[PDB]
Amino acid sequence: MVLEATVLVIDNSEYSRNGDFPRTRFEAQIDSVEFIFQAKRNSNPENTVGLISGAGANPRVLSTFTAEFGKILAGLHDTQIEGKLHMATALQIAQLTLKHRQNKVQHQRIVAFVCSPISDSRDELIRLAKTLKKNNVAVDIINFGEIEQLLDEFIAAVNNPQEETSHLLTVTPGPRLLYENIASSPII
Amino acid sequence: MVLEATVLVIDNSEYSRNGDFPRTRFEAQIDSVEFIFQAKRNSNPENTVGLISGAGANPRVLSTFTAEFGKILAGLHDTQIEGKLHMATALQIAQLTLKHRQNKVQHQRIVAFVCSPISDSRDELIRLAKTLKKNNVAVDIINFGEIEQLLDEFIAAVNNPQEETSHLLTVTPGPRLLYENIASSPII
Amino acid sequence: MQIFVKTLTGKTITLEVEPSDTIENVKAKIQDKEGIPPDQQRLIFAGKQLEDGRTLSDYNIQKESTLHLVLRLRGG
Amino acid sequence: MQIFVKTLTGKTITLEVEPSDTIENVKAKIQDKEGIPPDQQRLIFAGKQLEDGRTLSDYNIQKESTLHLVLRLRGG
């Protein structure tokens, strides 16, 4: 499809362990990382993807950009459910990662899951959104668990009109797993 | 038992309609008002109880103090699920109501349900707690639905040590209805 | 045409609508089935959020589609 | 003596404790059954909230009592 570097940010916050999204919201998010990686990878052999814990006590890069399923898997094991979600920080380190993506012909995209109440200000988040748009990064939020949308106003802000690259997925607990809802979403 | 005027404050906020507490948190709270009224009334024939919607757009007095089950029932019908919980305001109008209770030999008590995230500041709530204690009003919070305790620090503040009149009930969704958990609680 | 509304409590209610109905109309049909006013209603279908004034043709909503109803929380 | 811990997901796990056990110890026994650290644990029994350093004799907890485990949320 399209050549792009994408960064997956996961919510590893204390909210991540919950019944509503089987098996737990965290684990939902793991199957989702796996799926999404294997997807982006086969839409174009040149795609590379990164991984970021977005909670804990300071968002951290779990894996740099790869085609390698092993180090996505190595980075996915060795994270932990703990702390609160620091969204704007996570978004900052995701952006910093994308600027330095090898092969600058790659379109920039960040994909983030939010299953927590957002502690950050709406103003910081909107500034951040406008910045992201300006730097030609597209954003996909996955919005499940507590559904609060701020998120709608964010995606509104960050979307690039002339090529509509930025989507909000709002998903409710139900029959299908989280990764399926993601497969059928415009994030494809 | 003890001669007292008590004020029931209910959370009528948009959170009130929810599955977790059957039939809905609001309705849980109605059966609870009914129970509690009929209880306090038979621990002493001289007790009188009041009712306060604590949400909506401005906490309002649904019934003044009575022995009358009809006007508790009339005040209970004619409230509505709407708005957000304004706790400290609700607590203010409850206190104002108790000061003017006829028959000042009645010990003062407010009983309040919180099934919403508390929008008020911790500082305002702690000031309010210290004030309440100073004015010899005892407080029972019912804490269900979203359980956030602030509430623990509140009841800590407001409790009168030498006669321990102030209780926190933290209750989780389960087999028993909300009014049963309240019957077995120290609020009796 | 008949459609479905699943509240968070798993209760699925059925509504009779035709494809040109505004979402703001659906939220009123939902009001008289469940006693909850439209300004308290939020509608979720296909991962997106149904907007007032858009209609069901707009969202490609078709017979036996299942809408999800969640709390539209305003001043909190 | 054996007791019960019901998480919000309805899963009831059984623990072996004796009546003098600290709550802080119970939260560790709960950790190695469910992989969740004590600083993330909040325990609810009889409407009250179990405190660290108090023991189960303190709370009059007895055989087949059911504890409820909810998230202790710190900096939020």
Residue numbers in the entry:
A (entry chain A), B (entry chain A): 1 to 149, 153 to 191
C (entry chain U), D (entry chain U): 1 to 76
Excerpt from the publication:
Here we report the structure of ubiquitylated-Rpn10 (Ub-Rpn10). The protein was crystalized and the structure determined to a resolution of 3.1 Å. The ubiquitylation site was clearly observed at K84, a residue previously identified in vivo as the major ubiquitylation site7. The structure shows several non-covalent interactions near the isopeptide bond, which are mediated via a region in the vicinity of Ub-I36, a well-known patch previously shown to interact with other UBDs18. Inspection of the Ub-Rpn10 crystal lattice reveals non-covalent interactions between the vWA domain and the adjacent Ub-I44 hydrophobic patch from a symmetry related Ub-Rpn10 molecule. Detailed examination of this postulated biological interface shows a network of hydrophobic interactions between I147 of Rpn10 and Ub-I44 patch. Taken together, these results demonstrate that vWA functions as a bona fide UBD and point to I147 as the centre of the binding patch. Superimposing our determined Ub-Rpn10 structure onto the Rpn10 from four cryo-EM models of the proteasome2425 revealed that the conjugated Ub clashes into Rpn9. Collectively, the crystal structure and its interpretation in the context of the cryo-EM data, the in vivo and the in vitro experiments—point towards a scenario where K84 ubiquitylation dissociates Rpn10 from the proteasome due to steric clashes with Rpn9.
Rpn10 decodes K48-linked poly-Ub-signals into proteasomal degradation. Rpn10 is composed from an N-terminal vWA (Von Willebrand factor type A) domain that was shown to participate in proteasome binding, and a C-terminal Ubiquitin Interacting Motif (UIM) domain that binds Ub through Ub-I44 hydrophobic patch. Rpn10 is loosely associated with proteasomes, but the structural mechanism that releases this Ub-receptor from the proteasome was never elucidated. Large pools of a proteasome-free Rpn10 have been observed in the cytosols of several model organisms, and has been postulated that these shuttle ubiquitylated substrates or other Ub-shuttles, including Rad23, Dsk2 and Ddi1, to the proteasome1113.
